[PDB]
Structure 1
Amino acid sequence: PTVSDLECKITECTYASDFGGIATVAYKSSKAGNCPIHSPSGVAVIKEN
């Protein structure tokens, strides 16, 4: 991993849903890796980790 230039764009969402939110995180890495996707919220969770 090396993470730089991170942005979140939400393309579409279902309002306050089970996992009805679809968003894309576009990014730059200096070294490709696998980075954990996350939200520290308890009123929101990311489906994937």
Structure 2
Amino acid sequence: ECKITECTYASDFGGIATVAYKSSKAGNCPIHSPSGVAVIKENDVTLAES
């Protein structure tokens, strides 16, 4: 599940959010939003167990 933390209606990366990951193994994971509504500066996140 995805939870917003604090979004700023601005031009810089003011939007932040926390994702409650529910994974099984550990490894890299690319992140991307296909929609053009939001742009994510973060590129890669390693996944731990939940």
TM-score, normalised to structure 2, is 0.67
Of 13-22 and 29-38, more deviation after overlay is shown by 13-22
How many residues in Structure 1 have an aligned counterpart in Structure 2? Answer: 43
1:18 offset after TM fit, Å?
2.5
Which whole-Å CA distance do the structure 2 matches of 1:44 and 1:16 have between them? 11
Which whole-Å CA distance do the structure 1 matches of 2:29 and 2:7 have between them? 23
1:24 offset after TM fit, Å?
0.9
1:43 offset after TM fit, Å?
3.5
What is the percent sequence identity of the aligned residues?
Answer: 100
Unpaired segments of 5 or more residues in structure 1? 1-6
Q: Once superposed, which parts of structure 1, at least 4 consecutive aligned residues long, lie more than 6 Å away?
A: none
Which whole-Å CA distance do the structure 2 matches of 1:10 and 1:16 have between them? 16
TM-score, normalised to structure 1, is 0.68
Q: RMSD value over aligned CA atoms?
A: 1.5
